[model samples]
Target: ERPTLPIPDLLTTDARNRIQLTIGAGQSTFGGKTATTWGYNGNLLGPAVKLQRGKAVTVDIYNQLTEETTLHWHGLEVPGEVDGGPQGIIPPGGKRSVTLNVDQPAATCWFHPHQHGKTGRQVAMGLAGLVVIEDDEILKLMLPKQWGIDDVPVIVQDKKFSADGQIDYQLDVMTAAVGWFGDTLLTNGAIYPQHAAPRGWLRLRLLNGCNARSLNFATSDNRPLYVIASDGGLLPEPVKVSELPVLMGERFEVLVEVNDNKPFDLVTLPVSQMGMAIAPFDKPHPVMRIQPIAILPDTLSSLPALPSLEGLTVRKLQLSMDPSLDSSGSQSLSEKYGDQAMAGMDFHHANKINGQAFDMNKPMFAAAKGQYERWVISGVGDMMLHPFHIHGTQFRILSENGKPPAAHRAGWKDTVKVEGNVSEVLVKFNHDAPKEHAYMAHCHLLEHEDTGMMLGFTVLQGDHG
Candidate 1:
């Protein structure tokens, strides 16, 4: 039997368009001994911030920790100023406010600390929450509308604990080269948790809050999981699948129908294809168990036709590592791809984007606002996979490996994975981002991000929309 799952409250703003968030340290006995952690507005994971689409709000962030921090609205389509990239830093006891006009469709986004070099350490210590965007169209759908009841938020992260009961932040050569995978699994800041609910169709907004590890989400009974939405918003229709694999910084809205009176757990089985797994690695690890019920709706909203790919300028961003292969992910992969990436990206470091490490002062290129570009993310070498995430916009996945996207990945997404392969997307920036506060595209594995597997680009004001 699992312990009761922690359901966090949804934070609301005032009529004056102000939402307060304070980042501070905390302590908790997560699974074993007591461990020191961090959270937003609380001791563990922060409360989900609920906002209506098309509403403009100012999020007042106060840094209460000793080190610097920044509250990044992950998956939100905002300007560079409010995107909370590396340049926007909030020092110790410092305060910063960002205004956001929610213009995109309703989706399950998230928020976390985006400090320059401390993102992995801070996020793995228990600092993250959900940002549920709602729109009139999404509201009209016959879906689970309630929060923490029929509708739920699932924030998944893994952590490694030290003998002193504090979260560890040591960097190994392998971790620096790729990612940091932990030994313990937690959902919404609790281990082996359970959720109770009435019998019906339940909506679960899932976030891969882990620093690097990619998880394959499944149920105890191996029932079919209905995926209704990806990073940006709802899919045209639910795509049925038994298992769903998710990478770091990615979000998916899934529907599960629980009819049995007996309880079952939502677990992650051993992963062999894309990313790393957690502790008790041999078998399935249960993150959350539910004695829940749910009834899914029959008809959902339909999406409009996709835009044409013609006349769009193509930009190639390669995801590859300097030949530092190991038994950890896939050594044979490095062998096949060879060290060709070294020529493209100057990699005194183990990993990098095209020809450079992450330089806050550098912009890889510039784009005109409101112009569509066919950006192709190409992965090479023997690396397992790199989830590429772009700031300030959501794009449509045009193709992967020269073919159409899979059933599970056919929608607007802000993050897409490259498993030693190529993926093309049609991207258009709707906001302005100057060079000083430019937007970023990076490997979402926080460790890789800090180690320079990222690139920055600026978007200027344009005539076309």
Candidate 2:
């Protein structure tokens, strides 16, 4: 029997819109050994901050770590300077303050370290937390209102432990190209954890914070999962599905109908179509076991329809890998597709977008603020899944692989899984991003990002460039 999963501390606002967060190092025992780790105001994971929409928030961030770090609000739509990108670094023993008006809709967001080349190691050691934004419309809905009771936060992560009980951050070339896979799975910073809830409709906000592993989420008995929200906010309607393949940096809110006297395990099923598996396991890995105690009251009677969109411009972008010959090594794919986006093929790095690797000095494209645009993002071939994410604004998925986006994805999103080769998203920038500090769009896989699979784009002031 495993111990109960620990729920992170919840942060509430005071009379003033002030919140304080500190980053430090500590030791925690995982896989039966005490290892040094990093965290935010705690030993392992940080607390969940609940902020209301349309309110001004001021968070004081202190960095006590030996090196510099940053706190990036994963799915929040704020200014690029205060968005916690690489430019917003906090040195050791440094304190910085950021203020922003919460204008986005209600959503399940998060904050994590975004240091270049060190994100995977830092997040794996533990510096991550959840952010729940609430709006008046969502509050009026008859949903689970109680925190840590019927509503829970599920942050899933994977890490590899060394023989002497140290958290390993070393990676090989192949692992860097694909992703780093850990041998052990943890939910909310605990291994083999379980939770007890009332036999009612349970709301779970799931965050996939792993470096590279993709989770094909399902139940033990192959039951349906009701998805209500994506990365940014609530979907137009609840979507019922058996397995949801969530890639790194993606989030989803789902409703699980807990029946009386029945217990089920949340697990990850085998996924072969999305490329290789991280671990060499033939069976599904159990995330958390939910046991129902007694009957409870019902919520969520009805839902309001989502808003509609008006006229918008369309933009096409292609994400491609380097050209490679078939197994024969004689005939090349360049002969087939013109090899427009092909780059130098090597073991360490060969990724590109629009025929170029990520260059900090170069701007991929330019967009105007307040102008709605539709972007078509497509992958090259079937190598691995890429969770493409944009920095400045949240977008809505129009289609995937030329078909309409699934019901769960028909909401505001900051990151999406490009699994079936193509995806189309609609976006609009609320703020301006000049050349000095532009926004970024890239593959969320930390290894791929650190290498060269990212691009920066600027959002100008008016319609004309």
Candidate 3:
């Protein structure tokens, strides 16, 4: 009996509307050795789903694996009929089709299996892939092209392997209580993968597709990465920052102008809390390294102007975690709700939704139909950062800590990071989200979500905007 893994591909190159996935598993060499491994494709991740905004597309997911599985479009705002979630799971040898209307601006999103309690383990094993939504309107501006030469999609992750080279996700109670951290850092499945970038500027679409780890990324040569887009779309302007924190499920887009003459490995360093006086430090020393690459010819493009996100009917909603928000006199709140407050030693409360959490069959789980809503999230308590993710729709971050805003966050997004004490986001759902297709809103941290730092919400019909 083989496991089911969905391998998806864009109907055409540079197209963003049609996605076809073949979900199956096979035996292969993992760490250059013979072993049984599951993937979206043969051994690599799955196919790339491409589309543009305002374009309606269809995604047919074939579960070729043995077990039951579902393909949640992660950030696309599709009606329940087309949104492939838990209800969309196909039994062994079954198939499910999801039709998504790209109403949001162009951005980077993904697809993965979202079975309750099994999502973390399955995804950690290599069950995810990237989706790039292209927009000709934005293409009017100068950005990197799809040559795989200059413009590249980087999925940064760290994994812990067993003696047999299989990914081991088991952890002790203490480790599970906090989060799982891996030592082997990889991008697109290669450890410390490198690229031969051009001398000019190049556009980089980034996804912190890691599970439990929070990565603080910086260029090895101490050069600044010009961040252009965030989880949503392009930022207002380029923010020149050296180090950026990519929490689980968060997306970051940067425009890098490689001036270094010598070819070298662009390193992604995963920081540990051992010696650092700032931030959480339960884990020991820092962890990271870079795979080297030689400099090459015209492998990049000019610093493209940020995508314009104007005249789009915007709706705003806010999410906070406050187990203490008495449902009455609540002022400031955390990202999780009362359930988090109740979670102690062996157990953790998965409180969210103004102190409420996710209940699968509960009626409150669904949203109204034919409505567009912008949702924001903020974290509360203990400086804990949550990899905030939504099921049906992708949104954009208006700002963080009330700051002006980043350049890459002006478009649409599905998942974003809500930092402890201070974090904010804005998203718009532009489709008729039926009750039957209820979406999930939860923390991406497998431990926290499993322990109860999560919830579910359906985008049904409503008149909030």
Candidate 4:
């Protein structure tokens, strides 16, 4: 039942050199073996496409699949043509390319098929990959350097497996409420993943690729992870944390000091309080095992912290649910909208900023360029947590409610978790905070996004607005 999904190798070079990406039809041992898979550049997931700020990048996407598809480089600021939205579809056996002038700061941006109405299932089945950008400003800082040893990538997801060990994608009422969960946890496409780290320190980069799941992550030893970066770049400083919540399509980077002789398993434990699912509730899955197999002689030194991104002029968004208030949550928005709403419309329960839902064509917030803004994202509903994501630039987490984010969250970020209460982010945007075109701020969950929980913001050239 386990389908072996193919994955592309990591592209570690700087974004200076040109690159080619393909969206193709392929077969893999998915769920457990031999299941048809779709993705960019490879089966299941694509290679980690690295980029550099201030560089020009060319991505050639070829769609060999029978279905039509497009690309959305989430977090990177580029022109509309190269952005690979719906208009740039790669037909069956067709090829297309997008050129992006790397104008944004370095962070873990990502790419995936963004064809309206189909992005949900496409990504659920595996059609996404990470895009890492390198900036000298960040590289100059004293962050964890080693790839597999210090810096690690953890993709958290939940899947439902067939008896043979493959993910089942058929949708049902349970799937709609809880999300697709797997009995076994996998990282970077491998089942029960493990990583070896130095005795002194390590940097872990995490991304939630699940369709509708939120991960509450922690180390087995209860040691705090010193967070230095989030969705954007580094924070002004570091904050220690036992666990942090990451929603689907969100990314977080933390500098964790795994200084110990004993072995530890870095685990992603789903919050039981988020509401019980049909799957087993106990036995949280181990995402990657970090063993201190080797000793590093360095003393316990405080790494150079990320610069605090504070004091930027701000814009705040008040998010709320549009459906009639239901404290019990007994009747979901789906039951309200039902079949009368578009196929994707009921998915909107999780989508909103303030009282308004997201409308792609309608303009939301318009601002001036070089505006340092602080945005506050709050929850209007009680059902689940929402991971708020911003396009264009990353920001420093000012506070959750009023306190600061974890040590890792103090740095620049593109996404932040808005749980039962409101969360605030301070961001400095200059480049494509575009005077004319609009940027996006929305919930990261694809299902929620499809239903209308996303919004747009534009940075005006001057007082012209």
Alpha-carbon TM-score of each model against the true structure:
0.92, 0.88, 0.76, 0.78
Best TM-score goes to which candidate?
1
Give one clash count per candidate, in the order shown.
8, 1, 50, 52
Global Cα lDDT for candidate 2: 0.76
Off by over 4 Å in 1: 273-279, 293-295, 324-348, 462-465
RMSD of 1: 4.3
Candidate RMSDs in order: 4.3, 5.5, 8.0, 6.0
Q: Which ten residues in a row have the lowest lDDT in candidate 1?
A: 339-348
If ranked by lDDT, best first, what sequence of candidates would result?
Answer: 1, 2, 4, 3
Local distance difference test, each candidate: 0.80, 0.76, 0.57, 0.62
Among these predictions, the greatest lDDT belongs to: 1
**lDDT by residue (tens digit), candidate 1, 1-465:** 577778888888887879999899888886668988888888888988988888888889999999888888888988988888889999899999888899999999998888876788888877888898999998888888778887899988888777887888755555665467667888888887888866767788888898878888999889878999999998988999999988899998999887757677788877753324323644688878888554366656676667888877789997766564334223332343334212121223456788567888889999778988889988865445678898989888887655788776878899887877788888889988998788999988887788777888999865554
Residue 37, model 1: Cα distance from true site in angstroms: 0.4
Better of 1 and 2 by lDDT: 1
lDDT tens digits by residue: candidate 3, 1-465:
111112234444225544567777766444465545567755656666777776766766777878887777665656656666555667778877666667656667776777655666667767778777777655766676754656777776666677887777853343334455565656776644456566677666677776777766676667677776665565555777877777678777777666655443344553432111112223222222222234512222233343355533332233343333222111111122222222221333433545554555553444444433344566644344566776655554555544644444444555565655344554444554455556667778765565545565556456656
Query: Compared with the true structure, what per-residue lDDT tens digits does model 4 show for residues 1-465?
Result: 222222345674345555777776676653346666666666667787877787776767777778887777876766444555444567878877667777666577677766644566777677888888878777767677665567676776655556664557743333333334455455776665567677777888788787766677788878787666566655556666788777677687777776567777777664543332223434455676776756621222233443444644556677654443222232443354343211221443434666576655666867556656667777634445567777666666667644677555555567777766778876655654432345667666565555456776666563343
Pairs in clash, predicted candidate 1: 200-293, 200-294, 200-295, 201-294, 201-295, 333-382, 334-382, 345-355
> In model 4, how many backbone clashes occur?
52
Query: In angstroms, what RMSD does candidate 4 have relative to the true structure?
Result: 6.0
Instruction: Write down the TM-score for model 2.
Output: 0.88
Off by over 4 Å in 2: 273-281, 295-314, 322-349
